[PDB]
Amino acid sequence: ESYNPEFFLYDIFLKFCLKYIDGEICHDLFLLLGKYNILPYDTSNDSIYACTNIKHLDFINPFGVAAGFDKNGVCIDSILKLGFSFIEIGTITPRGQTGNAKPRIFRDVESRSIINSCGFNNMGCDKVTENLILFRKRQEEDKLLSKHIVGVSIGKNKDTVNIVDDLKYCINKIGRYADYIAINVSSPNTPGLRDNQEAGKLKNIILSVKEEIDNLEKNNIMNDEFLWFNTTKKKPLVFVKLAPDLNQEQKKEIADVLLETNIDGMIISNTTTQINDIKSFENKKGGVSGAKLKDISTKFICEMYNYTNKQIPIIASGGIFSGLDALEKIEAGASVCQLYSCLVFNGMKSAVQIKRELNHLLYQRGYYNLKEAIGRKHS
Ligand SMILES: Cc1cc2nc3c(=O)[nH]c(=O)nc-3n(C[C@H](O)[C@H](O)[C@H](O)COP(=O)(O)O)c2cc1C
Ligand SMILES: O=C(NCC(c1ccccc1)c1ccccc1)c1nsnc1O
Ligand SMILES: O=C(O)c1cc(=O)[nH]c(=O)[nH]1
């Protein structure tokens, strides 16, 4: 039963690969398998009591795959069929980029931590749009994917002067195929990008992105071909992805801007540059993921949930491995969870296992459904 994601051999390979094989090389191999549809798949029916929503986005379960896992959208079907309800492809930029010099991704099995300085390696918005279009055409005839959601994370080329130009370019090309757009102002690996989390800069960025999406709708809704070729059949929602490396004053000013601009959600959070007690990383560059980011991002969720007076839905990212980790994120304020590091260290069985653990937890904790648990830490 090689098709079962819990098949015993997959973990044996994984322990070997995390020990002896370059991290990005391992990731390249996974992506190439997905193209040929030979990966295992999860055929379990998800519990309707663990579904969740952000506005009209109806997630069949609360676990998606975070951005940067399938940067080019070449592996969408196979990753989703592992048991995930959505994936955020990207981050994409208008032109392609090879990113920073390799090797640039390292993992620490002991601490379940990753450090990376990728630098927005992607094929560029136009080619990734073609990859997403192909998925959307497959989705239209594969009824078993008709409720899965795909968001697109968008950013800037390294040498772009005005970030807004690049975000508008991505909207006008790929926006009609996305269920949501994630604005990436939090990668630690593009010089200057995090400066755009300043309140005035962030406000202009959000308003510009929304205006570009609204103009896309205004200018094309009369067309014969239906504009929204996505899961929702609606214009994409807009999220912002924030960095955990901010002081309390910045978080509050950002929260005020999010309230004024009517952002549809905030992804909390990106990788951190403040962890340096991990010896095998100590002469390394970039952002840190995994278990050592869990507490950092969970507290950040609590702060932003309260700073935005619970008016802005939260997408949790950071150190989520277990059902209990996920429940901490949800009770802290998140409506839905994204995984990355869990996949690297737990492998093919990641979504089957975390969904089963979370279901058992909702039972033990006396919740009727998952939505009941959202923000319950603050009750
Ligand atoms: C190799 C690697 C590449 C990543 N690329 C992106 C990206 O392109 N856009 C983005 O918003 N986040 C990116 N991330 C951050 C993840 O989406 C996620 O926010 C981070 O890993 C924290 O989640 P985790 O602790 O579960 O791994 C990347 C992370 C890693 C390890
Ligand atoms: O070591 C890594 N991956 C391991 C890889 C795998 C899967 C199965 C057997 C052996 C290895 C894997 C790919 C995709 C999801 C989960 C696991 C990794 N470091 S950085 N980025 C990454 O993917
Ligand atoms: O491509 C990258 O370097 C990258 C982008 C991002 O947003 N987060 C991250 O950890 N790495």
TrEMBL record:
Coiled-coil ranges (or none):
none
Main localization of the protein described in the UniProt heading: membrane
Which residues of the sequence carry a binding annotation for orotate? Answer: K71, N116, C118, G119, F120, N184, N189, N270, T271
GO CC terms: mitochondrial inner membrane
Molecular function, one GO term: nucleotide binding
UniProt domain Dihydroorotate dehydrogenase catalytic: residue ranges: 50-362
Does this entry carry the keyword S-adenosyl-L-methionine?
no
Instruction: Give the UniProt subcellular location, in the record's own words.
Output: Membrane
Mind telling me what this protein is named? Dihydroorotate dehydrogenase (quinone), mitochondrial
- Gene that produces this protein: dhod
Residue numbers of the full-length protein present here: 159 to 567 of 569
